[PDB]
Amino acid sequence: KVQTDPPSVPICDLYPNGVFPKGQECEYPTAAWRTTSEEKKALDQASEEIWNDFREAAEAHRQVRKYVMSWIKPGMTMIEICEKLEDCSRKLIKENGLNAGLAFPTGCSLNNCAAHYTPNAGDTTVLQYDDICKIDFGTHISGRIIDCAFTVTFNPKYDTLLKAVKDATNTGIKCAGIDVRLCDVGEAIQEVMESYEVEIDGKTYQVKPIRNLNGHSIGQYRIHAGKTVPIVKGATRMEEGEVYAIETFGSTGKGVVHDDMECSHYMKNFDVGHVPIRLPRTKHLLNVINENFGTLAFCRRWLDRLGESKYLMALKNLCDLGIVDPYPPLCDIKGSYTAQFEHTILLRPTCKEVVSRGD
Numbered sequence: 047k048v049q050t051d052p053p054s055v056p057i058c059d060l061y062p063n064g065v066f067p068k069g070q071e072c073e074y075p076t077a078a079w080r081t082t083s084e085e086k087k088a089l090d091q092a093s094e095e096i097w098n099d100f101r102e103a104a105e106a107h108r109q110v111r112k113y114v115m116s117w118i119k120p121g122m123t124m125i126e127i128c129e130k131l132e133d134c135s136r137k138l139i140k141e142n143g144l145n146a147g148l149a150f151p152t153g154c155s156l157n158n159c160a161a162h163y164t165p166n167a168g169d170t171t172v173l174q175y176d177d178i179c180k181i182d183f184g185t186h187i188s189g190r191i192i193d194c195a196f197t198v199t200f201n202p203k204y205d206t207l208l209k210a211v212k213d214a215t216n217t218g219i220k221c222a223g224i225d226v227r228l229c230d231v232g233e234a235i236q237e238v239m240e241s242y243e244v245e246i247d248g249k250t251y252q253v254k255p256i257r258n259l260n261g262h263s264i265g266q267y268r269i270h271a272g273k274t275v276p277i278v279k280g281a282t283r284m285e286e287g288e289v290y291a292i293e294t295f296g297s298t299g300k301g302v303v304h305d306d307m308e309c310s311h312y313m314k315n316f317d318v319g320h321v322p323i324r325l326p327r328t329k330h331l332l333n334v335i336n337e338n339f340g341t342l343a344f345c346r347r348w349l350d351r352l353g354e355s356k357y358l359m360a361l362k363n364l365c366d367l368g369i370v371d372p373y374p375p376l377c378d379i380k381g382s383y384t385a386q387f388e389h390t391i392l393l394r395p396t397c398k399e400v401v402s403r404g405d
C-alpha cells in the first residue's frame with residue numbers, strides 16, 4: 047500500500063477510498079468571495095468525481111516525472127526513454143482501454159525541435175550531453191487529461207533559458223482565471239519571457255516566445271477543446287468549469303515553428319463522424335484506432351505495440367480522407383534551442399487548481 051522503487055503500484059491502490067490528492071489551490075486574480083460562496087461550493091461538489099479523475103491522472107503524472115528525472119541521461123536512445131517512461135505511466139494509471147491510460151504520445155523533442163517528436167520504430171537517435179529535451183506526456187482517467195511537460199538538460203549553459211520559460215509559464219498560471227481574457231494571459235507571458243537575456247556558447251539572445259505555439263482548453267478525450275492561450279501579444283475569455291493546459295515555449299531562434307522530420311503523431315479529427323470504409327487494411331486500421339485511442343492522439347510505436355504492421359498506406363489513406371490528422375514535429379531554425387514548461391489547471395467554481403502541481 048506504499049509506492050515501490052521503481053514505481054509499479056497503481057495510484058488507485060495507493061488511495062484505497064478513491065479520493066485523490068488535490069493540486070495547488072489558488073485564489074483567482076477581489077475573487078475571494080468564490081471560496082466561501084454556498085452556490086459555488088455546491089456547483090464545485092457537483093463536478094467532484096470529474097476533479098477526482100483529473101487528480102488521479104495528476105498523481106500518476108507526478109510520480110512518473112519524478113521517476114524519469116532520476117534516470118534520464120545522455121547515452122540512452124530516445125526509444126529507450128519513451129518506452130521506460132510509458133511502461134511506468136501504464137502501470138501507475140492502471141491502463142484499462144479508453145477508461146484509463148496514456149492521453150497522447152510521449153514527446154521528447156530535442157534542441158530546435160519544440161514539440162510533437164517521438165521516435166518511430168528504427169529511430170537510432172541517442173540523447174546527448176548538450177541536448178535540450180522537452181519531455182511532454184499525458185495521462186487520463188475517463189478522458190480527463192493531464193497535459194504536463196518539462197525540459198531536461200545536462201549542460202548548465204541552458205539554465206537561464208529554462209528559468210525564462212519556467213517564469214513565463216508560472217506567470218501564465220498566475221494570470222489565468224474565470225472571465226480573464228486569453229490575450230491578457232498571452233501578453234503577461236510575453237512580457238516575462240522577453241525580460242530574459244541568455245548567453246549560450248558566447249552568443250547572446252533575448253528569449254523569444256514561440257509565437258505559433260500556445261496553451262489550450264482541454265475537453266473530455268479532446269486535448270484541444272477549441273480555445274487557445276497565446277504566448278505573444280496580438281479578446282475571448284476563460285469560463286468557469288473549463289480546464290486549460292498553460293504552456294510556454296522559449297526559443298533562441300526565430301520564435302516560429304514549422305513542420306519538419308518524419309511524422310510520429312496522429313489523432314482522429316473530433317468533428318468527423320462515422321465514415322464507412324470498404325478498403326480492408328484502411329478499415330482495419332480505423333477499427334484499431336477507434337478501439338484503442340478514440341479521439342486521443344497516438345503514434346506509430348503504439349500501433350506497432352498492438353501488433354499492427356504494413357499500416358503506413360492505410361494510415362495515409364485515413365489522413366487523406368480527413369478522418370485522421372497528422373501532427374509532425376514542429377521545429378525552429380537549425381542551431382536554435384527551445385525549452386517548454388506546461389501545467390494543467392482546473393477553473394473550479396471556488397478556486398483555481400493547478401491540478402498537475404503537487405500541494
Ligand SMILES: Cc1ccccc1OC[C@H]1CCCN1c1ncnc2nc[nH]c12
Nearest residue numbers: 150153182193269270311312313343373
Ligand atoms: C488539435 C490541434 C490543432 C492545432 C494544433 C495542434 C493540435 O493538436 C496537437 C495534439 C495532437 C498531437 C499531440 N497534441 C498535443 N496537443 C497539445 N498539447 C500536447 N502535449 C503533447 N501533445 C500535445
Ligand SMILES: [Mn+2]
Nearest residue numbers: 182193194195
Ligand atoms: Mn503537452
Ligand SMILES: [Mn+2]
Nearest residue numbers: 193291293388
Ligand atoms: Mn498542451
